[PDB]
C-alpha cells in the first residue's frame, strides 16, 4: 500500500545502513516503489562465492 518514499525510508536505507564489510562488493543498487516493493541488488566480483 505504500509509496516508494515510505518504503525507501523505513526499509531501504534501513538495510543500507547495515550493509557493510562484505567482500567483493562492486556496487549495490536499490529500487523502492509505490507498489510497496523493494529490490536491493549487490554486485560482486566474478568468481566471488554465490
Amino acid at each position: 500500500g505504500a509509496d516508494a518514499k515510505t518504503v525507501q525510508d523505513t526499509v531501504t536505507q534501513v538495510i543500507e545502513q547495515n550493509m557493510n564489510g562484505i567482500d567483493n562488493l562492486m556496487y549495490m543498487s536499490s529500487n523502492s516503489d509505490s507498489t510497496g516493493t523493494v529490490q536491493i541488488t549487490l554486485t560482486f566480483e566474478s568468481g566471488t562465492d554465490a
Partner: protein, 250 residues
C-alpha cells in the same frame, strides 16, 4: 616533549581497547620519518620508554605507550599476551586477588618485565535502586511508566527514526544532564497517577550503592584475566613469558 620526533597526535576519550567508557581513553601518534628521527632515542621504543617513564608521574592513570607487534592482527602492541584463568570456580575475587598476587610479585622483576598490567577491568560501585511496586500500585501508578519514567530520563532511550538530508537517523529523549547527574534528581522525576496525580519517583523508590564489574571476561569459556606488559629492555620475551610462568605458579 616529543615534538621533534612527533608529527601528530590522534587521541580518543571514551574509546579504547580493554573496554569503553569515560574512565578509559587512548592515543594515536604519528612520528616523523625515521630519516627525520635519527638514532635510537628518536625510535619508538625509547620514545615509549621515555613517554612511559614520564607518564609515571601522571596521576590517576595507567598510561602506557607501546609499539605494535609484528603480526598486528593478534595484538594492539608488542609484548606478551598471557591469560589468568579461573578453573576452580574460585570466583571473581580470588581471580582479582590472585591476579594482583602476580602483578605484585612481577613488579619486583623490572629486570625482566616492564609495564605489566591487567588488560581487564575492576569492580566499580554500581548504584542500585529499588522499587516497591506495592507502594507504587498502592499509589496507583503502574510500574512500566516508572520503567519508562526511569530508563529514559536517567539513561535516555531510543524511539524511532527520521530522515536527515535523505538518510535515516535516531530519535532521542532524555533528561538534561543537570537533571540526571545525581541520585537527588532521581525523585525530582515524577509519575502521573492513574487518577492523574503526579507522583514523585522517590516516593516509591529506594536505592543503594553496589559493586559491579564494568566488564566481565572469560577464556575458552572460563573466567580469565589477561595480563600484559613487556620483557624489560634487553630481555627476550621467552625469558619474560617464562618468568611469568614461574610467577604463574605461586
Amino acid at each position: 616533549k616529543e615534538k621533534n620526533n612527533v608529527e601528530s597526535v590522534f587521541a580518543v576519550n571514551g574509546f579504547g581497547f580493554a573496554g569503553r567508557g569515560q574512565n578509559t581513553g587512548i592515543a594515536f601518534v604519528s612520528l616523523k620519518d625515521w630519516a627525520d628521527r635519527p638514532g635510537e632515542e628518536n625510535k619508538v621504543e625509547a620514545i615509549t620508554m621515555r613517554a612511559t617513564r614520564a607518564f609515571s608521574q601522571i596521576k590517576d592513570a595507567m598510561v602506557f605507550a607501546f609499539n605494535l607487534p609484528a603480526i598486528v592482527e593478534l595484538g594492539t602492541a608488542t609484548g606478551f599476551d598471557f591469560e589468568l584463568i579461573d578453573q576452580a570456580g574460585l570466583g571473581h575475587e580470588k581471580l582479582t586477588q590472585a591476579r594482583n598476587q602476580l602483578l605484585a610479585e612481577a613488579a619486583k622483576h623490572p629486570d625482566m618485565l616492564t609495564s605489566v598490567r591487567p588488560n581487564g577491568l575492576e569492580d566499580t560501585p554500581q548504584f542500585k535502586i529499588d522499587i516497591d511496586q506495592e507502594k507504587a500500585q498502592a499509589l496507583g501508578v503502574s510500574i512500566n511508566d516508572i520503567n519508562t519514567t526511569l530508563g529514559a530520563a536517567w539513561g535516555g532511550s531510543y524511539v524511532n527514526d527520521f530522515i536527515d538530508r535523505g538518510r535515516v537517523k535516531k530519535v532521542y529523549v532524555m533528561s538534561e544532564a543537570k537533571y540526571r547527574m545525581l541520585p537527588d534528581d532521581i525523585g525530582d522525576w515524577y509519575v502521573r497517577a492513574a487518577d492523574g496525580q503526579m507522583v514523585p519517583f522517590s516516593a516509591f523508590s529506594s536505592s543503594r550503592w553496589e559493586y559491579g564489574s564494568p566488564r566481565l571476561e572469560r577464556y575458552n569459556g572460563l573466567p580469565s584475566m589477561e595480563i600484559l606488559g613487556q620483557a624489560a629492555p634487553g630481555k627476550s620475551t621467552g625469558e619474560a613469558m617464562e618468568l611469568m610462568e614461574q610467577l604463574a605458579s605461586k
